[PDB]
Structures are given as structure tokens and as C-alpha cells.
């Protein structure tokens, strides 16, 4: 399989501009006829070269001549000499009940559901299958009454019937041009929640929300959600729907999390489905940050598309921007702010340093399904966030103004969105486009002096990438450092030099450069990269007590939180080192005081205490360090709880008790209580034994709410307490019918800390809940023990590997884009130790050698062996 390379782009030898589809739906076959307007814009002699897979030609026609001029060759079907404006038309058959892969369509339970994203239209039928060809669809579906009485795709119905021998129809327009990955298709029975959203210039817009028969009880959070969505991207970014329907459709089986198919949202039902004993807060809060993503690509992604795949992050990094901005302005910006910084610095940090390293706009594509990452999406919203932080939110909104009306019903480029930014604002970009072209993480070191005798503070800061295994060449980039001083009061002293004030975001520019400020009267505790103003590793030689100072004193919450992620940092890796030479976990007092002070602080906000309070993931501990020891940080990340449980017990039991809350309500003021009352929980589950069973059985049976029952069972598990066999066993018999919440049960297995973890996790490979036929199950059990229990995965008899090369084995020729996700563990061998990395690397070479070995996998095993 041959890679693609950015720089190979070139504008398409025909368009087409109009499609006409028709679907004979049936599960085992489906005919489809396609029939497309097609202009040439290349060379008259240019064949058109058309995209498919797995499809079974039926027939090709010119207007309606029975074409000869072809031929079919390995992924598509090549048309000569044809006239400059046609009429093509195809019949094929394909076989939605064969396609485990999940890709084109497939089946969904009883259902039939398409994905498309991102070459997914070629396995329905043979097309342009590129996104800078847009075309006006219409689609014609015939199916089985009885089976499908609700036969959907994009847009509005213009054409109905009936049929004879039980078969109806249903013919939809969208009048929006399109690129085909935006197509979707949907039948089957359903129950459908339907409401309305009126717009602020008056268009109405009916709000149709489809689930499985049985789950209307769960579908209102989710409409709420869409309205939310709705009216807040008009206040915010002055936007409204350009449509007269809005149908979601939630579907059991889907690789990924939703899917933005114009005017007919697929939505995996994990982001969907949620009532008060099914789903946690936080569950919550993501079907809302989800439900809004989609809803947001309206505009950044559907209006505006990409020119090609390699510009993913055009729509990807500006849409989770956006989701984030809607978190954030509706809920805790600081909580907000926080977790996305922890999925920096832990999980996308990890990525950089891979193998599978790229930039934000990548240049060399094999599987095109390899770059829906943590890269293009979440780095991709910290260099959108870069911009905004750059112009500020009125140049920001020009910008955003400029692009749609110049892009407005086409396919761009990120430099094209980056254009309209500089143009709109004038603010010059040109050296920040490198963030689009560079891949791996900046290090920005500062050093610091203060001169007592001129009251200057002087700010030497410095920038690195390291090189990584994609690129051999790197250079500076522009760096939005953002800084603020206190004075030892905990005011903020102005920023100022010669006389005028100095804004607070530096611009770090240079391998090396000095900044100097004036009247600093009193040396000061600087707070630095505030609001992890750039994607970067920050280097600073932080005494503890400008730590504690920080938590103590700084105006911003995540200044707080951060701070104290630093100051856990030091003994993070102190106590790894220590576990590697077989000693007790040490830690200095007046750092389990910094952390009592915090417990006990009345004015902190309690959604930033939780925070402060939830311990650096095992992820994002193995950041700190070059090579990963997982079990010494497994090991450390609990015997620091344990310190803290036991230093800070009487605190925590009395914050614990001081906020229970009788009444269950999804508000943000009681999630944030109820985040500090189960952060303290998770401490108190570690301390002695005997008060942890009781307060942990006893939150588990008296819960209300799932989120207070998952809470006191996840600790039971992570502490090993007496009740946790029972609470487990209660959990299964109560919920095993429903695999959304099994889900939370099977990730508890896997990331269980018990010796015998492996061989329970492979005896649930056999649970009534658990099927290799279901994305989420396999990622609930198979890629949470792979990925998040990285001392069970990183066993030092290999265990781990060898179980995760048998579930690829199947997944391989399963569903590849699932196989391509649980990979990831093991394609970061050479962050590992000799052995580990030796065992890794076979497991590798046994993949390597898979008969019909997937481009997925093909992709990720040939750069992590190199
Ligand atoms: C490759 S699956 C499609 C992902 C979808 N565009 C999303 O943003 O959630
Ligand atoms: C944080 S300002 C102090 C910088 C340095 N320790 C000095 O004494 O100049
Ligand atoms: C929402 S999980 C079920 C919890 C309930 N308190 C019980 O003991 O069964
Ligand atoms: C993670 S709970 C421990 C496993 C439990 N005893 C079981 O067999 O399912
Ligand atoms: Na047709
Ligand atoms: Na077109
Ligand atoms: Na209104
Ligand atoms: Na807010
Ligand atoms: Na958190
Ligand atoms: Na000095
Ligand atoms: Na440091
Ligand atoms: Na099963
Ligand atoms: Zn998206």
C-alpha cells in the first residue's frame, strides 16, 4: 500500500457536479445506481478515474450509450473518451451484512447506517471520492416496510410511494453541494424524539433525534444538548442553520464517536443515550461537548470543507476549538481548560514523541483513517486557540467572518483559514503557519534574573523541537508565551518597560531571546506559559514554595491547578527513582500541606479543588520522563495516595461529608460538588480498611446517580477493598443487558491493579456482555487494558503483548480502523527498556507477518520498526 503525499496535490480532471442515487436496500444485497453530471476540466485526452471497493460492476453507461472504454483496476474503475459534459451512470451491488469493517454501509443491529468519512462513499459506489469534489445529492431508497419503515439521508423529502410486495420509497435533496464523505443513509425502525429550534432571524427548524425502540427514556439530555449547541453558536460565533430538519440517528455499532453528515448527524449512542442511573456527569458533559462538535462542523467542515485530506485539521482543529469554547462558556472554563491540558501534556505529548509523529497538517498519508488524532484534533484546537490568543476574540471573529465569506460553498486549505486571520485582523502569520508544518513538541526553557539595584526582571527564554523520526530539520516557531508577576502579596505587578505598558503575551520567536520589564518593585513569583498559552514543554527551575505560592495566590484557576502539577512533578519523579532502588515513597510535608491548605481553602471554587486534588493519570506521569517505567509509576501514582489518605484522612472525611448532596441534579455547581466529594473519596478508599469498605459500599448501595455509584465502585476496584467482588457481581446482574453502561464494568476489569488482572480480563472475552462484533466493547475491555493499565500491558513476562498481538490477529481482518487504535500501546517500544522494548518489537515482527495484513496496522508497524 503506497503512501500519498501532501505536496502530489493537484485540482481534479473532472468535476461532478449533481448525483442521483437510488438504493435497492437489502442486507445481504444492495443495488445501487449512480447517476452523476460530470464536466472535464483537464486535458481532453484524461481518462476519469473513479474510486471503489468491494464493489460488483453491474453496468456502466455514457448518456445512456452502454459504455465499452473501460476497465477496472485494483481500487477503481478508469473511463475513456468522453465527451467535456455527460451523464454517467453506475450499477453496482454491494452487501451491507458482510462489512464488519464499519465503512460505507453496513448494519447497525437491525439497521442499515452509513459512514463515509473519510473514503468511505467509494465502497457504496465508484466515484470522485475527494472532498474538493462537491456535488448536489439526491437520494431515492427502496426497502422493505415492515423491516425499514424509516428510510433517511441527507436534507428534505421531495418524492415518496409505495410499492408492491411490501416495499415503500423515500427520496431525499440536499441543496448544498457536497462532498461525498458528507453522504449518509440511514433505515430502520426507530423511536424518534422530535422538538424544535428556532432561529434567531426566525427559521424554524424541526429537531428529529432517532434512537432504538425502548430508548426514548434517554434521548432528552441529547436534544437539549443540540439546542444549546444551536443557540449558542449564534451568540457566540454569530451562526445559524442553513437547514429546515436536523436528524440525529444513534446507532450501537460505530468505530469512532459521531459524524457531522449534513442535516443527518450518526452518532455513536455512547454520545447519545444517557438518563441519571445509566450515565456519570461526566458522561453528561461529553454527549454535550459531542452533540455540539458535530453541530458545530455546520459551518467548519460542511459550509467550508477541505481541499483534501491532508487539510483534516482545517475543520478537526477549529471544531474541537469550538466544542471547547461551548464547554467552556456554558460550564467550568477552568475545569474545561484543565482536562484539556491534561490530554496535551499526557496523551498528545506521547504521540509527538512516537513514531506516528506528524504535524498538524500532515504530509504523507498511507490510511487516510491514521490521522483522526490526537495531533489534528486536540493540537490542532491549541494552534486555533494560538490565533485567538494572538488577535483576541474581535479579531478573531473577523477572521472567522473573512473566511466563511470568502470560502463559503467551497473546499479550503489550513493556509487558506490562516490567510483570512492575518488578512482580517493584521496581525502578521507568516511565521506561525510553521505550527502547521512542524511536527513534534517545542521546549521553551527560561532562566530568570532580578536586579534589586535597577528593579528590572529579565526573562531569558529559549526554544527547541527535537527532531523526530518523520523530520530531520527543525526550526523556531512563533510561541504566544503568556506571563503574569506577583508581588509578595499576591498582587499582579504591571507588565512595563521604558515607560509604557508591555502586553503579557510574549512573543517567543527565537532560538534565544531576552524579554526585560521595569519597575518590578518587589522580586517577583512569576506564573508562566499561563493558560498553556502554546503547546509546549515548559522548562523552569521552580522552587517549592513559588509553587505553593502559586496555588495559594495566582488570579487564574488553571495557574492554581498548574502550578500544582508542578510541584507534584518533582516528586513524581523522585519517588519513580526511588521504586526502582526498592524504597518507601518519601515526600516532604510542607507539600502534603500545600494540598491540606487546598482541602480546607472555603473561597477556592470546588470544580477547581477537585482538580487539584485529582492526581497527574498514569499518562500523563509517564510524560515526565524519557524512558517509561509504567509499573514504578503505577506504583508510585498509588502509594502517593495512600501518603495523602493517610496525612490528610481527618480533612478529607470532613470535606467528603461537607459535600453530599441529598437532591441529584445535573447543573454544573453540583457536578463540581460532587467531583471534590468523589476526589475525596478516592483518597479515603486507600486509607485504612475497614472506614474505606464501609464508606465505599455504603456510597455504592445508597447512590441515586450513576455517577456516585461508578465513583465507589472504580475505588473499590483501584483500592482492592473487601466489597469490591460483590459490588462487581451486583453491577453485572443488574446492567449486563445494557453495553453502554457495561462499558464503565469492562473498563474497571481492564484497568483492575489485582496480580490475576489478565487472566480475568480473557475470561471476560467470554461475558455475556462483551462481542468482538462491537467497537465499544472492544475498547471498554481489549484498549483500556492496552492503553490504560500500562503496568498489566507492560508485564515483564510479555503477557501483555501476546495477548494484545492475538485480539489483532482477529481484528486485523475484523476491522482494521479498531485494530489501527489498539495498536497505539505497542508501537511506543522505544520509550521502553531494552527487554520490554525486544518484546515489543516481536510482537511487532508477528504482525508484520498477518496474511492480508490491513494498510491500517501496514502503516503503524512499519514506522514503529524502524
Ligand atoms: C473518521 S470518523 C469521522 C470523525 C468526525 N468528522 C468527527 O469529527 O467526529
Ligand atoms: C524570580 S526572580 C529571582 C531570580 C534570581 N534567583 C535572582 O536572585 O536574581
Ligand atoms: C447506578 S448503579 C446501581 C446502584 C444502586 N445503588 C445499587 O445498589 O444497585
Ligand atoms: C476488577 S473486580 C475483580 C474481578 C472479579 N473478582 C471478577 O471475577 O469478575
Ligand atoms: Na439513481
Ligand atoms: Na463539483
Ligand atoms: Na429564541
Ligand atoms: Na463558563
Ligand atoms: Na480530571
Ligand atoms: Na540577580
Ligand atoms: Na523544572
Ligand atoms: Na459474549
Ligand atoms: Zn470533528
Request: with cysteine; glycine share 4%.
Amino acid at each position: 500500500p503506497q503512501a500519498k503525499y501532501r505536496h502530489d496535490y493537484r485540482a481534479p480532471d473532472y468535476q461532478i457536479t449533481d448525483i442521483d442515487l437510488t438504493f435497492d436496500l437489502d442486507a445481504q444485497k444492495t443495488v445501487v445506481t449512480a447517476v452523476s453530471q460530470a464536466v472535464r476540466h483537464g486535458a481532453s485526452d484524461a481518462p476519469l478515474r473513479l474510486n471503489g471497493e468491494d464493489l460488483k460492476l453491474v453496468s456502466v453507461h455514457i448518456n445512456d450509450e452502454p459504455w465499452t472504454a473501460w476497465k477496472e483496476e485494483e481500487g477503481a474503475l478508469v473511463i475513456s473518451n468522453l465527451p467535456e459534459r455527460f451523464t454517467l451512470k453506475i450499477i453496482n451491488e454491494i452487501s451491507p451484512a458482510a462489512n464488519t469493517a464499519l465503512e460505507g454501509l453496513y448494519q447497525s443491529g437491525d439497521a442499515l447506517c452509513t459512514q463515509c468519512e473519510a473514503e468511505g462513499f467509494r465502497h457504496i459506489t465508484y466515484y470522485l471520492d475527494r472532498p474538493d469534489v462537491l456535488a448536489r445529492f439526491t437520494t431515492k431508497i427502496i426497502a422493505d416496510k415492515i423491516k425499514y419503515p424509516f428510510l433517511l439521508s441527507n436534507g428534505n423529502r421531495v418524492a415518496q410511494g409505495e410499492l408492491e410486495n411490501g416495499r415503500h420509497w423515500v427520496q431525499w435533496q440536499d441543496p448544498f453541494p457536497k462532498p461525498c464523505y458528507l453522504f449518509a443513509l440511514v433505515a430502520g425502525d426507530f423511536d424518534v424524539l422530535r422538538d424544535t429550534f428556532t432561529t434567531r432571524s426566525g427559521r424554524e427548524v424541526a429537531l428529529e433525534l432517532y434512537v432504538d425502540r425502548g430508548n426514548l427514556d434517554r434521548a432528552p439530555w441529547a436534544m437539549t444538548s443540540l439546542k444549546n449547541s444551536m443557540k449558542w453558536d449564534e451568540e457566540r460565533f454569530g451562526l445559524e442553520y442553513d437547514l429546515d430538519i436536523y436528524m440525529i440517528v444513534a446507532v450501537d455499532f460505530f468505530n469512532a464517536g459521531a459524524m457531522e453528515n449534513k442535516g443527518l448527524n450518526i452518532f455513536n449512542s455512547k454520545y447519545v443515550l444517557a438518563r441519571t442511573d445509566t450515565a456519570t456527569d461526566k458522561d453528561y458533559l461529553d454527549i454535550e461537548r459531542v452533540i455540539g462538535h458535530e453541530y458545530f462542523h455546520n459551518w467548519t467542515g460542511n459550509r467550508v470543507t477541505c481541499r483534501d485530506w491532508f487539510q483534516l485539521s482545517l475543520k478537526e482543529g477549529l471544531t474541537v476549538f469550538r466544542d471547547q469554547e461551548f464547554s467552556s462558556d456554558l460550564g467550568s472554563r477552568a475545569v474545561n481548560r484543565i482536562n484539556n491540558v491534561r490530554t496535551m501534556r499526557g496523551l498528545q505529548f506521547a504521540e509527538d514523541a512516537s513514531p506516528m509523529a506528524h504535524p498538524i497538517r500532515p504530509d504523507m498519508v498511507i490510511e487516510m483513517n491514521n490521522f483522526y488524532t490526537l495531533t489534528v484534533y486536540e493540537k490542532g484546537a491549541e494552534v486555533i486557540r494560538m490565533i485567538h490568543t494572538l488577535l483576541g476574540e474581535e479579531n478573531f471573529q473577523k477572521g472567522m467572518q473573512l473566511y466563511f465569506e470568502r470560502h463559503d460553498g467551497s473546499a479550503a486549505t489550513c493556509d487558506d483559514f490562516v490567510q483570512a486571520m492575518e488578512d482580517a485582523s493584521n496581525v502578521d502569520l507568516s511565521h506561525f503557519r510553521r505550527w502547521y508544518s512542524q511536527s513534534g513538541t517545542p521546549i521553551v526553557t527560561v532562566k530568570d534574573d532580578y536586579n534589586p539595584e535597577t528593579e528590572q526582571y529579565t526573562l531569558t527564554i529559549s526554544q527547541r523541537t527535537p527532531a523526530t523520526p518523520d523530520q530531520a530539520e527543525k526550526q523556531p516557531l512563533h510561541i504566544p508565551f503568556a506571563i503574569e508577576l506577583y508581588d509578595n502579596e499576591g498582587k499582579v505587578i504591571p507588565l512595563q518597560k521604558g515607560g509604557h505598558p508591555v502586553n503579557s503575551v510574549l512573543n517567543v520567536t527565537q532560538a534565544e531571546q531576552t524579554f526585560v520589564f521595569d519597575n518590578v518593585y518587589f522580586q517577583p513569583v512569576p506564573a508562566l506559559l499561563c493558560e498553556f498559552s502554546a503547546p509546549v514543554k515548559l522548562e523552569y527551575k521552580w522552587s517549592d514554595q513559588q509553587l505553593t505560592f502559586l496555588m495559594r495566590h495566582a488570579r487564574n484557576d488553571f495557574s492554581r491547578w498548574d502550578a500544582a502539577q508542578s510541584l507534584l512533578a518533582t516528586y513524581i519523579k523522585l519517588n519513580v527513582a526511588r521504586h526502582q532502588q526498592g524504597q518507601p515513597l518519601s515526600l516532604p510535608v510542607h507539600v502534603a500541606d500545600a494540598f491540606r491548605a487546598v482541602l480546607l481553602d472555603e473561597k477556592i471554587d470546588p470544580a477547581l479543588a477537585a482538580e487539584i486534588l485529582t492526581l497527574p493519570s498514569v499518562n500523563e506521569m509517564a510524560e515526565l520522563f524519557d524512558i517509561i517505567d509504567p509499573i514504578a509509576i503505577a506504583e508510585v501514582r498509588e502509594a502517593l495516595t495512600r501518603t495523602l489518605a493517610t496525612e490528610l484522612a481527618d480533612e478529607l472525611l470532613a470535606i467528603y461529608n461537607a459535600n453530599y448532596q441529598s437532591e441529584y441534579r445535573v447543573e454544573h455547581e453540583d457536578i463540581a460538588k460532587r467531583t471534590l466529594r468523589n476526589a475525596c473519596l478516592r483518597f479515603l478508599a486507600f486509607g485504612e480498611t475497614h472506614l474505606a469498605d464501609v464508606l465505599v459500599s455504603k456510597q455504592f448501595h445508597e447512590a441515586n446517580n450513576m455517577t456516585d455509584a461508578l465513583a465507589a465502585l472504580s475505588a473499590a476496584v483501584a483500592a482492592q477493598l473487601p466489597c469490591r467482588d460483590a459490588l462487581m457481581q451486583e453491577y453485572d446482574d443488574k446492567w449486563h443487558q445494557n453495553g453502554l453502561v457495561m462499558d464503565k464494568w469492562f473498563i474497571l476489569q481492564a484497568t483492575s491493579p489485582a496480580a490475576n488482572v489478565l487472566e480475568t480480563v480473557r475470561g471476560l472475552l467470554q461475558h455475556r456482555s462483551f462481542t468482538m462484533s462491537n467497537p465499544n466493547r472492544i475498547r471498554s475491555l481489549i484498549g483500556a487494558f492496552a492503553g490504560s493499565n500500562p503496568a498489566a500491558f507492560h508485564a515483564e513476562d510479555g503477557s501483555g503483548y501476546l495477548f494484545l498481538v492475538e485480539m489483532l490477529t482477529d481484528l486485523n481482518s475484523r476491522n482494521p480502523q479498531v485494530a489501527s487504535r489498539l495498536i497505539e500501546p505497542l508501537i511506543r517500544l522505544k520509550r521502553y527498556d531494552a527487554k520490554r522494548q525486544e518484546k515489543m518489537r516481536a510482537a511487532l515482527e508477528q504482525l508484520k507477518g498477518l496474511e492480508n495484513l490491513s494498510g491500517d496496522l501496514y502503516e503503524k508497524i512499519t514506522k514503529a520498526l524502524a
